[PDB]
Design a protein around this ligand. Structure first.
Ligand SMILES: OC[C@@H]1[C@@H](O)[C@@H](O)CN1Cc1cccc2cccnc12
Ligand SMILES: OC[C@@H]1[C@@H](O)[C@@H](O)CN1Cc1cccc2cccnc12
Ligand SMILES: [Ca+2]
Ligand SMILES: [Ca+2]
Lengths: 324, 322
């Protein structure tokens, strides 16, 4: 098993990613998580992270790990409607079994003292073997680590597997002021994204909308978790996905963005990758936050996922959700 | 037990209402349900109704009953975001257990065949004993039955217990063209509501915002269903309420659940007689329930001072039925 840190922002697929990574102990040793106040309210995202970890700890061989709240602040905040989803999860019966919440109450004081960005730096740099960072929220925390420590940090990173951006497809940031070319995670903090994508000593795997568009969250698949209600993780993952399926009345859509990214960490058969030099628009233009190809000399490459193995991924998630 | 039909529009509390009615078999015999394309997409609301009924049949021996979709159309439709909540429920693991889905698939065609409004008329008029209609969506279906059958329908109704309106508090319909005094269920179809509230020979109990304001859905209580995860209905009820705790006129309350609780046990609230008219003209208070001065106007019993602790305990206990 390789050391993994999950750097997330507490939306529903962030938690599905957490389950995928935590549950696959043969492949992934989850040595820590951090939550960013982006696509969630950080207090809720933090609490749900702990509640999931404690459910799993009490029911399978998952060692406890540190969880930190990131101090990162938004350049462009998410819609408030979307940020509420961690609050809903915090209140779910499946996450509020007394034995699990008793454990969380007991270990919370240790965890709420961590500063998330410093926690990320420390876990990566003090690991004996290299650490893979699965980034499923904005790139603020990795950039912070880069700015503070440079090569002392990046030399200890196995690779960054990042959910973010949109290269040869439309983005998903549709606002009166935007032209729709940007993806949300990058748009939340373009400058941090620019630091990460332009970093010369960092290996990056990028799950942009180019690949994630191929795995929308759809009812017939989600209903399969109903076949598995004896498993706590299937009640958990199925419940989260059920809140993400396409309501027939609506005409933006939900995909397995972060879950696919985590699935790749578990097994790289999930997608092939193409080397692309990725720069980021940081200026306050309609295309702020866009990830664009650059032909600048000596620009570092990023390995952009393509043609993901959707069935393989969907089967992986369903099986992982039977870990307990 | 007394005969009850649930006339609902498929939002989360509509389904909590259904669980309360269905689980309290000592008090309530649920003889049918209707779903209206108001605060849901009716196909989703229909499926969730069936899926809940089938789970409860397999786990607590709840007798199966007809479920019909109403052809009623909106005067003023609900916001689309709010209507999507039944879609989420339709895909919930708890509602998609093979034995329960297999039963639903087996009986779905029979239920698809009903026209919901006619079904409500028939269930009521063909029953040996009188029937209590618990209305948790708009009043379109009760009005349709009144319009078509009149006294032949109303004489078979024990009482209507209705979630709707706002009497001495503001409403919850906040739009550029409104003054905020109307409540959504009435606003969706004011003319139908007027028909119901003005109908003679029909006993009406009214859960307006005056009473329902006392029961906002809040995290501490919701989390208590976590204590009862051995019970399918506690996973079900807890999950639905957990989807409501963030809400922020957008605030979520146990509106329909309190209404159904009263059907189970009238100690949930005392009532006061009020003659209720409904504004139907296209004015800022369109859909408002107001006191009318009309001579010999029929009374409606408006709920007052609900017993919140009693309700909360009832729901936690009902969610242990299976
Ligand atoms: O842009 C995709 C990122 C992913 O990391 C995932 O957590 C959701 N997130 C932002 C996002 C984009 C588009 C639609 C959304 C709807 C609800 C919540 N987040 C959304
Ligand atoms: O006006 C209250 C009625 C109840 O029957 C309940 O099912 C919801 N419904 C409409 C409604 C009103 C106010 C806020 C809401 C938020 C989400 C969904 N419905 C709402
Ligand atoms: Ca995310
Ligand atoms: Ca309703």
């Amino acid at each position: 098993a390789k050391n993994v840190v999950l750097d997330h922002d507490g939306n529903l697929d962030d938690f599905v990613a957490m389950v995928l990574l935590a549950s696959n102990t043969e492949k992934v040793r989850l040595i820590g998580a951090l939550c960013t106040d982006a696509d969630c309210f950080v207090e809720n995202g933090f609490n749900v992270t702990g509640k999931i970890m404690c459910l799993m700890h009490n029911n399978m061989n998952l060692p406890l790990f540190p969880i930190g709240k990131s101090a990162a602040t938004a350049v462009n905040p998410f819609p408030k409607e979307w940020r509420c989803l961690a609050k809903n999860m915090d209140d779910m019966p499946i996450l509020n079994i007394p034995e699990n919440v008793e454990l969380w109450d007991k270990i919370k004081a240790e965890n709420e003292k961590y500063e998330g960005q410093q926690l990320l730096a420390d876990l990566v740099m003090n690991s004996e073997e290299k650490v893979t960072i699965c980034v499923t929220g904005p790139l603020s925390n990795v950039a912070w680590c880069i700015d503070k420590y440079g090569e002392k940090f990046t030399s200890k990173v196995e690779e960054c597997v990042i959910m973010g951006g949109a290269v040869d497809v439309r983005g998903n940031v549709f606002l009166p002021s935007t032209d729709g070319t940007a993806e949300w995670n990058i748009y939340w903090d373009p400058a941090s994204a620019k630091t990460v994508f332009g970093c010369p000593g960092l290996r990056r795997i990028m799950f942009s909308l180019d690949s994630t568009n191929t795995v929308p969250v759809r009812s017939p698949y989600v209903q399969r978790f109903g076949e598995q209600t004896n498993f706590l993780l299937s009640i958990l993952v199925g419940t989260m996905w059920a809140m993400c399926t396409h309501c027939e009345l609506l005409r933006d859509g939900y995909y397995a963005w972060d879950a696919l990214t985590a699935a790749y960490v578990v097994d790289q058969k999930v997608a092939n990758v193409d080397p692309v030099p990725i720069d980021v628009v940081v200026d306050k233009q309609p295309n702020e936050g866009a990830t664009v190809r650059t032909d600048a000399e000596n620009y570092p490459l990023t390995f952009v996922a393509r043609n993901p193995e959707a069935e393989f991924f969907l089967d992986m998630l369903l099986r992982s959700a039977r870990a307990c």
